[PDB]
Paper text:
For processivity, PolIIIα binds to the DNA sliding clamp (β subunit). structures of the complex in both a DNA-bound and a DNA-free state to 8 Å resolution. exonuclease simultaneously binds the polymerase and clamp. conformational changes from the DNA-free to the DNA-bound state.
the clamp in the DNA-free structure showing the ‘DNA-free’ map. panel: bottom view of the polymerase showing the ‘DNA-free’ map. end of τ is in contact with the tail of the polymerase. τ500 and the fingers domain of the polymerase. between τ500 and the tail of PolIIIα must be stable.
Residue numbers in the entry:
A (entry chain A): 799 to 926, 938 to 1088
B (entry chain A): 436 to 653
C (entry chain A): 74 to 218
D (entry chain C), F (entry chain B): 1 to 366
E (entry chain D): 7 to 188, 208 to 243
């Protein structure tokens, strides 16, 4: 909710950065905002402090390798490193994300070999778009949501539909017009979908996301058509619908269901679009 | 034993798997003060499954006997109390598993009625917000040598403030984040502090469904 | 107590006046400050030595120190246990007597009545009540569980 | 299908072929045996995709061809349990196999021969023959240095180097090394092949240490071993084994001997008071005197004094004691010779009088 | 003498009377004597009087047109009654089947009382729930638990389940038995002292003056 | 504080004392031994706080009183490890124990004797001595039937009951039961005590079967065994062992006799095709014939038919084959006699020659 508000108000807003980042969300002078570290789901508390501590003792980290040497694998685990890339923590340095994911292990090995040269090991016999442009936008932003919670640069289709819409979701639904169950118009910006089962049959599946930048849910008990409505529902960069809404009894998820579907073209029917040019 | 909890707990002790019982408890309305009498009036499927299902009947008959009953001490305390002498002059203690976090064995209402003055614990993190925002404002000091900022020293007629408010941009504005409340703000276009004092008192089922809000605005 | 090791017994503790009330308040605090396990907080029997005046003691019945020792049939252990209350709580320590149709109650009762006459000690009967009506037993069982 | 056999002909094959089989593998049919009667011959084939064991036993009475497959483990236990000298008559009828002996009668569920993965017949590349007892030595002297679960997958196994008139074995996990070199007495082709941990376990298992020659066929990606009419074949993995000539200490100038069993009993004892995690010990050596010390978190200490033959400079070096105890136990000798270079390089360990077995462990710095 | 049944039907009602407006399609039962199948199976198909429900269709498959010529419950009323009368009725989710059975019995209008009045209906789920608390105790759950396949068997419907349930039932109720085994006499009466009686009087005074009653002094 | 003993006087004591230790000793000093030197006697205690072992050996060499507490397993292994004939010199210096042997020296951290918990001296109630052999037969014959983890924690152990000149043991699950009785040759007072399973395991392990008699003391809360100069002490579990005389079959009317070995061989083989978890096998008996049958959930089938001496009525009975093999393994006899009742009762089983052992197991009705 907060981000949606932020965004509408302005920009930057930025991916996390191991060099610049503080304990929580921080404002550089220009940068309205930079990620707080605690935001990341997977990363431990120990690793967050480790990163900052290493940044303190060293200067800004010069490269991926330089980061890994300064903070040993013991503090910042490979699993930890993987989520940092997925967050976009490294993006500045390793413009090639794919390159950076792969380069971790080899770079870590050297650092450990420095540590080994130092202490307590057994010792050993012997012996031994991708470009300046990063990982693609669509795919990169997909990963970020999984790791952080949200899409960066706004949704894969973030930028308007408003006149139909209200973009408020559950927070709007609480105080609603009285009825059996709220009547609502939803447009889906992005959905990734199948029709699933259970080896018995099973009620599902709609995956609804509500934009502009608001909130998305599994849902959860529906169905109507059997397979025909299900596939219309399906799958990349298209949907507006009419669907009946209730506020779920259980907290932490609501009902937003597709009772009706309309196509991009059908959504373009939406009432009947008019052309507005601003000259 | 709140409505959801008592059903869950009785159902498990009656030996149903989690799935069976949750199919029932999810039909119990959300409300904070939920009781069996309230549940029966809010949800018509409850009367019906009671008469149609012997297991549900056995379960609700038992939930009726245990309705409201106290289960355990609590993840959180109720408040901090100040005695004129040692607390043991008035009550015994309860403490956690390490004998830490000592608490009065009498609750909120009872402990004070037995004569010691109390001070509430408050979880809200709006002052943490203000705190952090003040830190961040006062950093902007050395960046341009500007005096640190005193939220208490702000003028009471500020136009920026009322401009943003008349723009209805009041989500994350404390207590006034409701869509309904923003509906009201939109129509009213509130332009003074008196109106701000009024908002929370107006934004209720009574005031809205008695026309006084509309009278006031008109 | 160190006599029966880890085994917990039941005790009913009354504050008879305000001296007792303050001693009882101290005793409760002391138990919680000591810490405990899944069974909940426990007292040392010998806390009753210093934390003593204004308190009147009930033995706990079959589930008490003396009841459990009686059921074992360790006569020496029984005598040592009561002896403590005869020293520190003369006329202020009571045998609980219970006939609720539960395992060992009548056997204990018969042996406790013999002990009570042999020691000059007093008994009091309770019903160890947990519910209003007999059909509430099932609900109490569920409450405990 | 029908044949009848003498328990004693069937039993050792059954044991050799069953013994590595997990009771319950991940792919069911792998726990069953392929049974083939053709001509006067029973061929047994059981596999785990890594290795395969084939046994033949002579059918002297009337017999009838066909194909079948029964649970390996259970069949072996049944046959092990049978009375001494038992004549067992079994007959396949449809998809039930009936097992008779005397008045015992059995009926087993059956999975088809057709489902069994027929792996490939291949052309032999390098061939040689040897006593069973030499093979067992070669393997025993060396197999304990393989890793368990190291990323360098080619160390769970053994380098074969056949060159000139020699056959040589060496095994390692990156931390300790064992070499064994023995004359095979025939001119061979030049070929190298790494056979797996489980392959070496099973080859050692079937080395009934006696007279019989063992003939082995290595291919490019497969290996097969015949001793008489017991036939073992395993798949190989190919990859990049390390060069033992880079591990070999350069010219160890300093020599240190001591009596082997006294040395070993003393190391077994110092091991008890060593750090639990690394089993690490420190040796201090001086003219005709040896001082071994250890320490642990429990703040215990070990010191050993014994008389050893040592002429040379003092030296400071730490090892994991388990790793040297392993070699001292395998070496069944009187006196041993240790050849050091320095604390940071390989040390060679060997019987002062034989050279057939050689072990090198690289040291530690504590 | 022990009687095993499992009836799969023309689908069910989710709420209220699971039998109201619905009818039985197949009766498939095995008779069990001394924990063994004699092989005298009673396997019959009857008149739907309505359409097979989409749910029931997906359960094990079955066409409505197949049960059209087949007789009604009235044609095998006596036949089935005598087959089960005065015997042990072991059912899974007994409320379901019994509900349908007695439903159809009343529809005949033949003075035939409910089967539960002349036969002992015992639920196996209750027993399973006692033995395995909070575990899935469905037919297919227990099937997989004891490694029995009921999915790759040609029999779909009653006779399938009956057979399987019999084997499961016997297994659970065999399983290995166990050995195991599992007033007068003089006595002092401390009477309150005069000082204690003075404290008592003062304490009752407090009760009475503050409360307006004291039953001890009534 | 000092003493010197020879390794060979310490070896059998040390072995024996180290047995009871593995308890995941949570209170760390349970992994340690109590050494007390007083007089010319070093006393050892090795204990899990429920049971205890004390041994005295005489000290012929020089000694000085004082006490210490070293870690038990590690101390045991070092001493067992020292070479044959070695004279090992121990000496406590204040808070550290020094272990010397000739020229090697070891310094171990030490926990003080004064901290070591003491279980109380108590008084005996029933007393007897007997040949080791008799105690050996008695334990071996019954121990297998003890529960491991039961709610009735008193069944995790064995009932000792004396009566006339019989000591009579029983151990059980609630499913199977073995009883053993032997003549003891001495008048014995009647007593009842339950000794914990761990106790009986250790007691079993201390019997070498040799010539030293065993002498036992039993008090109210502890039980103690003296063989020569070694002393075992355990606590007892409180009581209330259910009356085995109630469960006994009252005149089992069918007599069924067979060669123990043959019978056991057939059960072992039949067991391979039972349900892995529950081991249920079904028995058909008829006039002088035994037909065994077994089914498992995977449709596999075993059958054994055998010639069995049997006079009585025809009946069928199913049971857990593991439990019956356990008894056949405990029955060290030629032929077994089985006494039956019906398809729904436990059966009584004996050695066809001795009433000394009695076994009764419950049926499963399949």
């Amino acid at each position: 909710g907060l981000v949606d508000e932020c965004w509408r108000m302005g920009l930057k807003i930025l991916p996390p950065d191991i060099n610049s980042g503080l304990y929580h969300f921080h404002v550089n002078d220009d940068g309205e905002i930079v990620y707080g570290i605690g935001a990341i789901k997977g990363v431990g508390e120990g690793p967050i402090e480790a990163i900052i501590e290493a940044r303190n003792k060293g200067g800004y980290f010069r490269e991926l390798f330089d980061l890994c040497a300064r903070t040993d694998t013991k503090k910042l685990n490979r699993r930890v490193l993987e989520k940092l890339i997925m967050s976009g923590a490294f993006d500045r340095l390793g413009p090639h994300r794919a390159a950076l994911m792969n380069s971790l292990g080899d770079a870590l090995k050297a650092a450990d070999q420095h540590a080994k040269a130092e202490a307590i090991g057994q010792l050993d016999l012997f012996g031994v778009y991708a470009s300046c442009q990063p990982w693609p936008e669509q795919v990169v932003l997909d990963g970020e949501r999984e790791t952080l919670g949200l899409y960066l640069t706004g949704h894969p289709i973030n930028q308007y539909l408003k006149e139909i819409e209200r973009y408020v979701g559950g927070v709007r639904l609480k105080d609603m017009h009285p009825t059996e169950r709220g009547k609502v118009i939803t447009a889906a910006g992005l959905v990734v979908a199948a029709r699933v089962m259970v080896t018995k049959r099973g009620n599902r599946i709609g995956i609804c996301t509500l934009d502009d930048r608001s909130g998305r849910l599994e849902v959860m008990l529906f169905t109507d058509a059997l397979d025909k409505y299900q596939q219309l529902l399906e799958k990349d960069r298209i949907l507006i619908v009419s669907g009946q809404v209730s506020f779920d009894d259980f907290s932490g998820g609501l009902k937003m269901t597709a009772r009706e579907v309309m196509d991009i073209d059908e959504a373009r029917e939406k009432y009947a679009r008019g052309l507005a040019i601003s000259l | 034993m709140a409505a959801k909890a008592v059903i869950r707990d009785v159902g498990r002790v009656l030996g149903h798997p989690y799935g069976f019982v949750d199919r029932i408890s999810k039909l119990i309305p959300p409300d904070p003060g939920m009781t069996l009498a309230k549940a029966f009036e809010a949800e018509p499927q409850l009367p019906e499954i009671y008469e149609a299902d012997e297991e549900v009947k056995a379960l609700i008959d038992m939930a009726r006997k245990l309705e409201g009953v106290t289960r355990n001490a609590g993840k959180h305390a109720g408040g901090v109390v100040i005695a004129p002498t040692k607390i043991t002059d008035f009550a015994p203690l309860y403490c956690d598993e390490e004998g830490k976090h000592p608490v009065t064995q009498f609750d909120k209402s009872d402990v004070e009625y037995a004569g010691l003055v109390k001070f509430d614990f408050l979880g809200l993190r709006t002052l943490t917000i203000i705190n952090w925002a003040l830190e961040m404002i006062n950093k902007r000091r050395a960046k341009n040598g500007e005096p640190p900022l005193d939220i208490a020293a702000i003028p009471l007629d500020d136009k920026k403030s009322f401009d943003m408010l008349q723009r209805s941009e009041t989500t994350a504005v404390f207590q006034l984040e409701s869509r309904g409340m923003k509906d009201l703000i939109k129509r009213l276009q509130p332009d003074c502090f008196e109106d701000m004092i009024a908002l929370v008192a107006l934004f209720r089922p009574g005031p809205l469904q008695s026309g006084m809000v509309d009278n006031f605005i008109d | 107590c160190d006599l029966l090791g880890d085994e917990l017994t039941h005790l009913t503790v009354l504050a008879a006046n305000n001296t007792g009330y303050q001693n009882l308040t101290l005793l409760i605090s002391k138990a919680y400050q000591r810490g405990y396990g899944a069974a909940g907080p426990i007292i040392d029997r010998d806390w009753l030595i210093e934390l003593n005046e204004g308190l009147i003691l009930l033995s706990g019945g079959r589930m008490g120190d003396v009841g459990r020792s009686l059921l074992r049939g360790n006569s020496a252990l029984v005598d040592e246990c009561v002896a403590f209350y005869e020293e520190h709580f003369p006329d202020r320590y009571f045998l609980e007597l219970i006939r609720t149709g539960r395992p060992d109650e009548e056997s204990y009762l018969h042996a406790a009545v013999e002990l009570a006459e042999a020691r000059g000690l007093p008994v009091v009967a309770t019903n160890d009540v947990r519910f209003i009506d007999s059909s509430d037993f099932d609900a109490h069982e569920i409450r405990v569980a | 299908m029908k044949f009848t056999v003498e328990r004693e002909h069937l039993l050792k094959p059954l044991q050799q072929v069953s013994g590595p089989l997990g009771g319950r593998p991940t792919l069911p049919i792998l726990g069953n045996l392929l049974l083939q009667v053709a001509d006067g011959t029973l061929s047994l084939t059981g596999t785990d995709l890594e290795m395969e064991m084939v046994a033949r036993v002579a059918l002297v009475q009337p017999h009838e061809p066909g194909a079948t497959t029964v649970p390996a483990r259970k069949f072996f236990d049944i046959c092990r349990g049978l009375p001494e000298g038992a004549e067992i008559a079994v007959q396949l009828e449809g998809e039930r196999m009936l097992v008779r002996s005397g008045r015992s009668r059995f009926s087993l569920s059956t999975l088809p021969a057709a489902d069994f993965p027929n792996l490939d017949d291949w052309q032999s590349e390098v061939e040689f023959t040897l006593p069973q007892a030499t093979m067992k030595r070669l393997i025993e002297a060396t197999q304990f240095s393989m890793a368990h679960q190291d990323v360098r997958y080619y160390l769970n196994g053994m380098l074969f180097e056949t060159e000139g008139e020699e056959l040589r074995t060496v095994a390692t996990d990156g931390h300790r090394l064992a070499v064994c070199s023995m004359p095979i007495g025939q001119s061979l082709p030049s070929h190298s092949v790494i056979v797996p941990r489980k392959g070496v376990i099973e080859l050692m298992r079937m080395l009934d240490g006696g007279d019989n020659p063992l003939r082995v066929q290595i291919g490019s990606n497969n290996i097969r071993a015949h001793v008489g009419d017991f036939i073992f074949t395993s798949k190989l993995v190919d990859g990049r084994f390390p060069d033992y000539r880079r591990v070999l200490p350069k010219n160890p100038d300093k020599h240190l001997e001591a009596g082997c069993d006294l040395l070993k009993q003393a190391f077994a004892r110092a091991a008890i008071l060593s750090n639990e995690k690394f089993r690490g010990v420190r040796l201090y050596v001086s003219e005709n005197q040896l001082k071994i010390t250890a320490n642990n978190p429990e703040q215990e200490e070990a010191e050993e004094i014994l008389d050893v033959t040592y002429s040379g400079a003092e030296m400071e070096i730490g090892f994991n004691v388990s790793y040297v105890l392993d070699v001292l136990n395998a070496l069944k000798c009187e006196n041993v010779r240790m050849m050091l270079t320095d604390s940071v390089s390989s040390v060679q360990i060997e019987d002062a009088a034989s050279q057939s077995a050689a072990y090198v462990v690289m040291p530690m710095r504590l | 003498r022990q009687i095993v049944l499992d009836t799969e039907t023309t689908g069910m009602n989710q709420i209220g009377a699971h039998y109201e407006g619905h009818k039985i399609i197949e009766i498939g039962a095995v008779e069990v004597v001394n924990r063994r199948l004699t092989g005298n199976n009673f396997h019959v198909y009857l008149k739907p009087d309505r359409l097979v429900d989409p749910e029931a269709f997906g359960v094990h498959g079955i066409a409505d047109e197949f049960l059209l010529d087949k007789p009604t419950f009235a044609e095998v009323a006596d036949e089935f009654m005598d087959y089960i009368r005065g015997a042990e009725l072991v059912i899974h989710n007994a409320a379901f089947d019994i509900g349908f059975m007695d439903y159809e019995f009343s529809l005949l209008k033949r003075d035939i009382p409910k089967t539960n009045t002349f036969c002992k209906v015992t639920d196996s789920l209750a027993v399973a729930r006692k033995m395995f608390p909070g575990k899935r105790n469905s037919l297919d759950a227990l099937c997989a638990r004891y490694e029995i396949d009921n999915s790759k068997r040609t029999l779909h419907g009653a006779l399938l389940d009956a057979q399987i349930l019999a084997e499961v039932y016997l297994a659970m109720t065999g399983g290995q038995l166990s050995l195991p085994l599992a007033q007068a006499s003089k006595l002092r009466v401390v009477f309150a002292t005069d000082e204690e009686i003075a404290a008592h009087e003062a304490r009752l005074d407090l009760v009475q003056k503050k409360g307006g009653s004291c039953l001890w002094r009534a």
